[PDB]
Design an enzyme around this catalytic site. Structure first.
Site, PDB file in Angstrom:
ATOM      1  N   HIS A 142      39.119  36.756  38.273  1.00 31.11           N
ATOM      2  CA  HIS A 142      39.505  35.724  39.249  1.00 31.11           C
ATOM      3  C   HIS A 142      39.625  36.394  40.625  1.00 31.11           C
ATOM      4  CE1 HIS A 142      42.121  32.207  40.689  1.00 31.11           C
ATOM      5  NE2 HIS A 142      42.428  33.156  41.557  1.00 31.11           N
ATOM      6  N   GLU A 143      40.341  37.514  40.680  1.00 35.16           N
ATOM      7  CA  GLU A 143      40.595  38.166  41.983  1.00 35.16           C
ATOM      8  C   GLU A 143      39.292  38.712  42.581  1.00 35.16           C
ATOM      9  OE1 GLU A 143      43.329  37.200  43.020  1.00 35.16           O
ATOM     10  OE2 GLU A 143      44.866  37.364  41.498  1.00 35.16           O
ATOM     11  N   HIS A 146      37.142  36.182  44.313  1.00 29.38           N
ATOM     12  CA  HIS A 146      37.481  35.851  45.685  1.00 29.38           C
ATOM     13  C   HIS A 146      36.613  36.694  46.651  1.00 29.38           C
ATOM     14  CE1 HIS A 146      40.504  32.865  45.277  1.00 29.38           C
ATOM     15  NE2 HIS A 146      41.365  33.642  44.649  1.00 29.38           N
ATOM     16  N   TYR A 157      40.547  29.073  52.881  1.00 25.97           N
ATOM     17  CA  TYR A 157      41.588  29.028  51.861  1.00 25.97           C
ATOM     18  C   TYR A 157      42.681  27.976  52.169  1.00 25.97           C
ATOM     19  CZ  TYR A 157      43.919  30.973  47.774  1.00 25.97           C
ATOM     20  OH  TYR A 157      44.470  31.167  46.537  1.00 25.97           O
ATOM     21  N   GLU A 166      39.626  28.459  44.892  1.00 21.59           N
ATOM     22  CA  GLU A 166      40.441  28.703  43.681  1.00 21.59           C
ATOM     23  C   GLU A 166      39.727  28.383  42.370  1.00 21.59           C
ATOM     24  OE1 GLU A 166      43.281  30.129  42.479  1.00 21.59           O
ATOM     25  OE2 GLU A 166      43.015  31.126  44.419  1.00 21.59           O
ATOM     26  N   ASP A 226      51.477  25.525  49.283  1.00 27.56           N
ATOM     27  CA  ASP A 226      50.369  26.208  48.574  1.00 27.56           C
ATOM     28  C   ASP A 226      49.076  26.019  49.404  1.00 27.56           C
ATOM     29  OD1 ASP A 226      48.979  27.574  46.443  1.00 27.56           O
ATOM     30  OD2 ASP A 226      48.604  25.664  45.453  1.00 27.56           O
ATOM     31  N   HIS A 231      45.932  25.994  44.556  1.00 25.90           N
ATOM     32  CA  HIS A 231      46.118  26.273  43.116  1.00 25.90           C
ATOM     33  C   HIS A 231      46.488  25.037  42.306  1.00 25.90           C
ATOM     34  CE1 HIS A 231      47.066  30.131  45.146  1.00 25.90           C
ATOM     35  NE2 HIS A 231      46.356  30.643  44.152  1.00 25.90           N
TER      36      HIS A 231
HETATM   37  N1  LIG Z   1      48.165  33.101  41.621  1.00 26.21           N
HETATM   38  C1  LIG Z   1      48.821  31.796  41.784  1.00 26.21           C
HETATM   39  C2  LIG Z   1      49.727  31.490  40.594  1.00 26.21           C
HETATM   40  C3  LIG Z   1      51.022  32.274  40.621  1.00 26.21           C
HETATM   41  C4  LIG Z   1      52.131  31.776  41.306  1.00 26.21           C
HETATM   42  C5  LIG Z   1      53.326  32.470  41.352  1.00 26.21           C
HETATM   43  C6  LIG Z   1      53.427  33.678  40.708  1.00 26.21           C
HETATM   44  O1  LIG Z   1      54.664  34.337  40.778  1.00 26.21           O
HETATM   45  C7  LIG Z   1      52.331  34.199  40.023  1.00 26.21           C
HETATM   46  C8  LIG Z   1      51.136  33.502  39.997  1.00 26.21           C
HETATM   47  C9  LIG Z   1      49.574  31.736  43.103  1.00 26.21           C
HETATM   48  O2  LIG Z   1      49.690  32.757  43.807  1.00 26.21           O
HETATM   49  O3  LIG Z   1      50.044  30.653  43.507  1.00 26.21           O
HETATM   50 ZN   LIG Z   2      42.937  32.927  43.478  1.00 30.28          ZN
END
Ligand SMILES: N[C@@H](Cc1ccc(O)cc1)C(=O)O
Ligand SMILES: [Zn+2]
Ligand SMILES: CC[C@H](C)[C@H](N)C(=O)O
Ligand SMILES: [Ca+2]
Ligand SMILES: [Ca+2]
Ligand SMILES: [Ca+2]
Ligand SMILES: [Ca+2]
EC number: 3.4.24.27
Length: 316
Positions: A142-143, A146, A157, A166, A226, A231
């Protein structure tokens, strides 16, 4: 570093033994010379200064609990590289064999991981919400996806473009998990999320609503948190991708599944030939329909199923 290509052995986060490509010069470093311009793994040492130190080990054996996240970040970066090369003929994230750099032990008890524009970064988790996040192959892929998106579509983003960004990372993270063929599924992060709870994850592509994410456009998040729901609204696209691959009836709309390989070809084509920084969900549907048309023909089942899946999630 300059040195000699070697092969070490260690255990990952989940206690699995695996071989890793290393480089010897006094110490054995986590530096895989066999993939492009190299895969390099660093120790952030519980700090937030990046990348930290190129990971060095005295004996080329990586069996300490402290080693485990480094082993997995390094190994899974390699699998993800293999996936993109073997499946899509793409050489690293820039398509030109760019060196892939990862840091582990980022901060203290850090419950996340990320691509920071330059490299992947993994927390160790707090031992309750997460164990070290590089233990999840879908997380690593996933990372690194990106980075692929950064060099191709460049989806901004935020809002719909960000939710597509995402979803692309969830889609290819999952396709890599299937490629590696170890306990694959359509959930995200199940290997590292909540060591005390069985059967959960961060997100589900097959049923986004399971973790509170929308599965239809009518249910999209419109707020500002977010980054405008990147997400959260990714559930809509993830659901569409799952339907294209596996099929099913969703809100009374039926989709004939065409399988993971064709899903991968269609979305990779959309990503690299049709999507732009500001593409919205509607434009993604257009890009995927055009990609399926290019590969299979305007009147193909593949085109029909792409249309069906987007109809099912309310995206015209
Ligand atoms: N990666 C996602 C899901 C996530 C959220 C909070 C976390 O502590 C960990 C993963 C985000 O950053 O929103
Ligand atoms: Zn991501
Ligand atoms: C893919 C999982 C990780 C934790 C990601 N940074 C979120 O989502
Ligand atoms: Ca050692
Ligand atoms: Ca799995
Ligand atoms: Ca998974
Ligand atoms: Ca769990």
């Amino acid at each position: 570093i300059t040195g000699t290509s070697t092969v070490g052995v260690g255990r990952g986060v989940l206690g699995d033994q695996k071989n890793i490509n290393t480089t010897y010069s006094t110490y054995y470093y986590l530096q895989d010379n066999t993939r492009g311009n190299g895969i390099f793994t660093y120790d952030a040492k519980y700090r937030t200064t990046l990348p930290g130190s190129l990971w060095a080990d005295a004996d080329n054996q990586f069996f300490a609990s402290y080693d485990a996240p480094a082993v997995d970040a390094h190994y899974y970066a390699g699998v993800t590289y293999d996936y993109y090369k073997n499946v899509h003929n793409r050489l690293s994230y820039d398509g030109n064999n760019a060196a892939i750099r990862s840091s582990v032990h980022y901060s203290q008890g850090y419950n996340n991981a990320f691509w920071n524009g330059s490299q992947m970064v993994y927390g160790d988790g707090d031992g309750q919400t997460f164990i070290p996040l590089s233990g999840g192959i879908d997380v690593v892929a996933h990372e690194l996806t990106h980075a692929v998106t950064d060099y191709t579509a460049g989806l901004i983003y935020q809002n719909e473009s960000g939710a597509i960004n995402e979803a692309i990372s969830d889609i290819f993270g999952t396709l890599v998990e299937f490629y590696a063929n170890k306990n694959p599924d359509w959930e995200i992060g199940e290997d590292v999320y909540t060591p005390g709870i069985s059967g959960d994850s961060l997100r589900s592509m097959s049923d986004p609503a399971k973790y509170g994410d929308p599965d239809h456009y009518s249910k999209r998040y419109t707020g500002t948190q977010d980054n405008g729901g990147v997400h959260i609204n990714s559930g809509i696209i993830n659901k569409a991708a799952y339907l294209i691959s596996q099929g099913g009836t969703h809100y009374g709309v039926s989709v004939v599944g065409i399988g993971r390989d064709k899903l991968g070809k269609i979305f990779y084509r959309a990503l690299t030939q049709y999507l732009t920084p500001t593409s919205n969900f509607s434009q993604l549907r257009a890009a995927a329909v055009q990609s399926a048309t290019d590969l299979y023909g305007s009147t193909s089942q593949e085109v029909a199923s792409v249309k069906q899946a987007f109809d099912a999630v309310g995206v015209k």
